[PDB]
Amino acid sequence: SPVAKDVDLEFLAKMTNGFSGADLTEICQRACKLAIRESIESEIRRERERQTEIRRDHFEEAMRFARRSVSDNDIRKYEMFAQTLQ
Amino acid sequence: RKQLAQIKEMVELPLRHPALFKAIGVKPPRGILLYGPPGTGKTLIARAVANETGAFFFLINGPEIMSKLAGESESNLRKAFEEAEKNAPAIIFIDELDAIAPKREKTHGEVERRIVSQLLTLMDGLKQRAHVIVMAATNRPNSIDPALRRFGRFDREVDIGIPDATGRLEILQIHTKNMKLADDVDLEQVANETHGHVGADLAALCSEAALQAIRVTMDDFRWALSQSNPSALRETVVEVPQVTWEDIGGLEDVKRELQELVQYPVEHPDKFLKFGMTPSKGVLFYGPPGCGKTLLAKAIANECQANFISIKGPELLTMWFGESEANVREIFDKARQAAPCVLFFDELDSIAKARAADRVINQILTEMDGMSTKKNVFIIGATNRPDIIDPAILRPGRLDQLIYIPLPDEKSRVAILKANLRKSPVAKDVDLEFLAKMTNGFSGADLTEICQRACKLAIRESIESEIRRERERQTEIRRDHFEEAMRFARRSVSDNDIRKYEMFAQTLQ
Amino acid sequence: RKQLAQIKEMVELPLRHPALFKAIGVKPPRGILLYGPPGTGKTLIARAVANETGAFFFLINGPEIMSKLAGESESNLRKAFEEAEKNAPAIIFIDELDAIAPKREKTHGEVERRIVSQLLTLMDGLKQRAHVIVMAATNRPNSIDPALRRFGRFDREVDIGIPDATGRLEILQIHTKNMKLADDVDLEQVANETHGHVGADLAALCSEAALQAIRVTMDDFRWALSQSNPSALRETVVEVPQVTWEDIGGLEDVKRELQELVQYPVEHPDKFLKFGMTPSKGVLFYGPPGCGKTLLAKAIANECQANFISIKGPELLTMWFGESEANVREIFDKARQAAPCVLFFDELDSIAKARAADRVINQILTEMDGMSTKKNVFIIGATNRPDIIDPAILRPGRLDQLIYIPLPDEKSRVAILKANLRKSPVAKDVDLEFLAKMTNGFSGADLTEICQRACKLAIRESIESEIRRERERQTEIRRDHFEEAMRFARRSVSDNDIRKYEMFAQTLQ
Numbered sequence A: 001s002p003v004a005k006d007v008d009l010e011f012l013a014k015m016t017n018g019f020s021g022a023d024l025t026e027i028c029q030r031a032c033k034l035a036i037r038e039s040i041e042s043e044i045r046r047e048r049e050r051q052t053e054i055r056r057d058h059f060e061e062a063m064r065f066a067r068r069s070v071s072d073n074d075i076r077k078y079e080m081f082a083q084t085l086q
Numbered sequence B, C: 001r002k003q004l005a006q007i008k009e010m011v012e013l014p015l016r017h018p019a020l021f022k023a024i025g026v027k028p029p030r031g032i033l034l035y036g037p038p039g040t041g042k043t044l045i046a047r048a049v050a051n052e053t054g055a056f057f058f059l060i061n062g063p064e065i066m067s068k069l070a071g072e073s074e075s076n077l078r079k080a081f082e083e084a085e086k087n088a089p090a091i092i093f094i095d096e097l098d099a100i101a102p103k104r105e106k107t108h109g110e111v112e113r114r115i116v117s118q119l120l121t122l123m124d125g126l127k128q129r130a131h132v133i134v135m136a137a138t139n140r141p142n143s144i145d146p147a148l149r150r151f152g153r154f155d156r157e158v159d160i161g162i163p164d165a166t167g168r169l170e171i172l173q174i175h176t177k178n179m180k181l182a183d184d185v186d187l188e189q190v191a192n193e194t195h196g197h198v199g200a201d202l203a204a205l206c207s208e209a210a211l212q213a214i215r216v217t218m219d220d221f222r223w224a225l226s227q228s229n230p231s232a233l234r235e236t237v238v239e240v241p242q243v244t245w246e247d248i249g250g251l252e253d254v255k256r257e258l259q260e261l262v263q264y265p266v267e268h269p270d271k272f273l274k275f276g277m278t279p280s281k282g283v284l285f286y287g288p289p290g291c292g293k294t295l296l297a298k299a300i301a302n303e304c305q306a307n308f309i310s311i312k313g314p315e316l317l318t319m320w321f322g323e324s325e326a327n328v329r330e331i332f333d334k335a336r337q338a339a340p341c342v343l344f345f346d347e348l349d350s351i352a353k354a355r356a357a358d359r360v361i362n363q364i365l366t367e368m369d370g371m372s373t374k375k376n377v378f379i380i381g382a383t384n385r386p387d388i389i390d391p392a393i394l395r396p397g398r399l400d401q402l403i404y405i406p407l408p409d410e411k412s413r414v415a416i417l418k419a420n421l422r423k424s425p426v427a428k429d430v431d432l433e434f435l436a437k438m439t440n441g442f443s444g445a446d447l448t449e450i451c452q453r454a455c456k457l458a459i460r461e462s463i464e465s466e467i468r469r470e471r472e473r474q475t476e477i478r479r480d481h482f483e484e485a486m487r488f489a490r491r492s493v494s495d496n497d498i499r500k501y502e503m504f505a506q507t508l509q
C-alpha cells in the first residue's frame, strides 16, 4: 500500500489499547476505502472539469468510527478461565 | 453581617418607621422566628438587632418560664409582654421557644396547653400600633406547635444554618483577635477544614487550640481540630459551591444545555417572561458512575451564583426504610427557603433500586408538583440507571430534561488529573496528556485511583527512604511513579455499559 | 490516674487559673459530664478531682432530689447551686443525673419537666466568672435529656468505661493491700481473667475471696471468680489490643498494605499532609473463615497504639431483627470519642446475608459519610463473602481498600500452633514445621482443632492413668499425641472456595 511516513504507527499502537487485530484491520480498510473514494471521486471530478498515497488524515478519519472488538467482560472471562482452567 | 441585614429589613422599618406601612395600608411582621442548630448565637443576633435598631429588649429564657410553678409561668409571660409593650420600640426574644411551646401531643399534661394558649393570646394581643416585635429561637420549625406559625403569630421565619468557609473564617478571626496567633497559623485553612462546625464548635476549637499551646501555633489548631466533635456534621449544608465551569474542562454540550435549562431563566428572565414559555422544573443526570454528576450540578449553581443541596441516597434509604417520607416536605421547605438553589438528589434510583417507597420518590413528586414554578429552585436527579427510576419522575413538569453525563473527555481527563493532584508536588515531566490519551474509556474514578496509587507509591518511597536514612544515620512525584501506578489501574466502565447508556440514551429519546 | 489527668486538664486550669482564658478571649467548660456503667466510682473520682484541685464539692444525689415533694426538689437544686456559687472554686457533682433529667417523653407528668427546666435555668445561670463547674453521672449519654448536651450546659463528655487488665490489676491491688494475701496468689492472673468486671465487681470478688478464705489463697480468688457475675459483660470493650505484628508471623503483604493504609497517616502525618492526598477511610478483610481477620485488625491497632472495637455480627443481627439502627450512631460516637481507634465490623455480610437492613448496613454508610476524615478512626469490614456486601460499602470514601486475607503461610501456621499451644506442656520432639508442611491448605481452625484434639488426648491419657493409679493404689504433650490427633483432622476450606476468592480477588479488581 502507499503509506507516507507521517503515518506513525505507534500513535496507532497507543490509541488502540484493547483492540483486536480485526479492529486494526477495519481501521486500515476504512482508511484505504476513504483513500480510494477520495481518489476516484477526484479523478471523476477531474474528468467532469476536463470536459468544461494514504496519510494520517485518512487514518484519524477512519478511527473516528472504529471499534474495540472485545469487551473487558470477555477478556476478564478468559483471564478467569485462564487462571481456573489452570 | 449579611444575616443581620435581612432581620433589620424585617424589623427596623416597622419598629422605627412604622407610620408608612400603617398609612400605605399594610401590616408589619409581628412574629419573626429565627431557627437553626445550637451554637449559632441567635440570642447575640437578637440583641445585636435590638441595639442596632434602638429598641428595648426582653429575653424569655424558655427553661426559666417552664421552671416556674404553673401560673407564675403565664404570669411571667404576661409580665414580660406588658413590660415590653410599655417600653416600645420593643423586641421580645424567646430563647428555646420549643420549651414552652412544643409539638403539642408531646405534652402529657394540661398546664403546658394553658401556657402555650397564653403565649398564643399574648401573640394575638399585640398591635403594630404598640411597636412590638417578637423574635424566637429553635433548632427547626418542626419543633414548635404549628398554631404558632399561624399568620397572626410567627409568620416570618429565618434560617441561621451552618456557616460556610467565610463565616467560619470571620468567627475564627473574631474569637482569635485576642490570641498569641503565630505566623505559621492559617485561619482560612482551618475555616476550610472546619466542616460541620458552628460558632460554638469554632469557639471551643480556638479554646482547645489556646489550652494546648498554654501547655498558639498551627500545630495546636490542627490538634484541636483532631480533638473537636462538631454538632452540625449531621445538618444538611446549604452553600453556593465554588467549582467554576472552567474547573470542569470539556463536557460542553452539557454546560450549554444546563445553561439553557437553569442559567438563562435566572440570568435573563426578561426573555423567558417575553417569549412566555416557563422554565424546566428540573433535570436528570444519568450515565456511568465514574463522573462528577455532583460537580456539574455544583458548577451550574456556582455559574448561576445559586445555592446547592446534596441529598445523598443514604438519606433517601434512611427515609424509606424508616418511612419518614415526611422529611421530604422539610427538605423542599429548606430548599424553597434557601432560594435560589439546586436541590440535587444523588442516586435517585436508591429507593426504587434497593428492592412507603415509591412514596418517598412520590413525596418528591407531590413536592415537585406543589412547589411554585416561579421560585427559582432547580432540582437535579442523579443516577446511573435511567431504567429504574419511577418514570413518573420523567413525566414533563418534573424531571423533564434528561441529560447523558458521559465519560470524561481529554480536556476533562486533564481537568480531573489536575483536580486530583491540585495540592501535590508534581514535576513538569508529568505531562498529563500522555495520561489523557492512555486513559481513553476511563472514568474519573480510574484517573483518581491512578493519582492516589502514584501518591501512595511516592509516600511509600519517601518514608521508607527516610526510615532507611534513620537506620543508615544510626551506623516530589514524577511519571516514574505514574506509569508505575498505571501498571495496575482499571478502565472502570465496560463497553457493554456505555453501549447500554448509548442505547438507553437513543431509545430513552 | 490517666483518667484524672484529663478531668484535671478540663477542670483545674479554668477553676483555679481562670483569668487567662477570660483574658485570652475564650470560655472554660461549665458542664463536664462523666458517664459509663455503674461500679466505676465516678463519685470517688469527682471528689478526688475536687480535693486535688482544691475546690468546694457539692453532691446532688438524684434520687434524693427526686424523693422530695414537688417544689422542694427545685428548692434543693437552687439551694445547692447558690451554696456552691457562694463557696467557689466549686464543683457541683450530680450523681445519677438521668434520675432528675431523663429522656423526657418517659415523663408521665409535668413536675419532672419543671424540675429539669429548673436544672437547665440553673445550668444557664452560672458564669465562668462565678468559678463553678458542674460534673454529672450516668450510664450512657443516651439516658439524659439532649437539651442538657446543649453547648450552654453539659458540653464536654468523658467516658469511664470498663477498666482493662492494668486498671483491674490496680483496683485489685488497691482493694487487697489490706488482705492476708498468700504467695501463690497472683493478682495479674485474676486481672487478666476478669473480663467484664468493674471496680465494684472486683471489690465484690476480693470480698468473696476474703469470706471464703475466712471460712487468702489463689484457690479462694479463683472460686470467687467462679462465683462472680460481672455487670459489664454486656458493654462494648474498648482497649488497645496486645497482639504484636510479630505475633502474626508471615502474612506480610497485608502487614505492609495495612501499614500504608492505617499506620503511615497516624505515624508520619507530616507526609500525608505534604503530598496532600488524604488517607483511606477504611478497609475490607475478606477471605476464608479460618483465619485471624480479627487478629490482623487488632495487630494494626496494636502497631499504631490505637484502640480497637469489635462489633460481632450478632450485634448487627440484633440491630436488624430489632430495627435498632439508631445504635450504629451510638457505636460510631463511641469510636469517635475513643479516637484513635479501629472500628472492626465482623461478618459485615450478616445483615445482607441473613435474608431496616441495608439500612443497618446503610446507617454504617451515613455514619462513615458523616464521620470527619481527620479524626483518626479506621474502620475494618470483615467477611468471607465480598460477593454479598452491599457494594455501596465498597464505593470510594467508605471501604475503599479490599484486602484478601488468605490462608495462613508456614510461618503463620507455626505462629498459630504457637498461639494455640502458648500455655501448655510441649516437649521439644514436637517440631512444628513437620506440622507446617503437613498442613498446607489448612485454616487456623484446623491447626487449632489439631492442637485441641491433641490436648484432649493428653488430658484423657493423664486422668485415665491417674484414676487407674487410684484403682491400682487401692489393691507433657508429644508428637505421639499430635500425629494421633491429625489422624482425624480436616482441611477446612476446599480448593473450590479458595479458587472462588482467587477469582473474586482478581475480578473484584
Ligand SMILES: Cc1cc2c(C(N)=O)cccc2n1-c1nc2c(c(NCc3ccccc3)n1)COCC2
Pocket: B243, B247, B248, B249, B251, B289, B290, B291, B292, B293, B295, B296, B408, B412, B413, B415, B416, B419, B420, B443, B444, B445, B446, B448
Ligand atoms: C478530584 C475528582 C475526582 C473525580 C471523580 C472520581 N471518579 O473520583 C469523578 C469526577 C470528577 C472528579 N474530581 C474532580 N474534582 C474537581 C474537578 C474535576 N474536574 C472537572 C470535571 C468534573 C467532572 C467531569 C468532568 C470534568 N474533577 C473540578 O475542580 C474541583 C473539583
Ligand SMILES: Cc1cc2c(C(N)=O)cccc2n1-c1nc2c(c(NCc3ccccc3)n1)COCC2
Pocket: C243, C247, C248, C249, C251, C289, C290, C291, C292, C293, C295, C296, C408, C412, C413, C415, C416, C419, C420, C443, C444, C445, C446, C448
Ligand atoms: C489462637 C488462634 C486461633 C486462630 C485461628 C483459629 N481459627 O483457630 C485462626 C488464625 C489465628 C489464630 N490464633 C492465633 N492467635 C494469636 C496469634 C496467632 N498467630 C499468628 C496469626 C494470627 C492471625 C492469622 C494468622 C496468623 N494465631 C498470635 O499471638 C496472639 C494470638
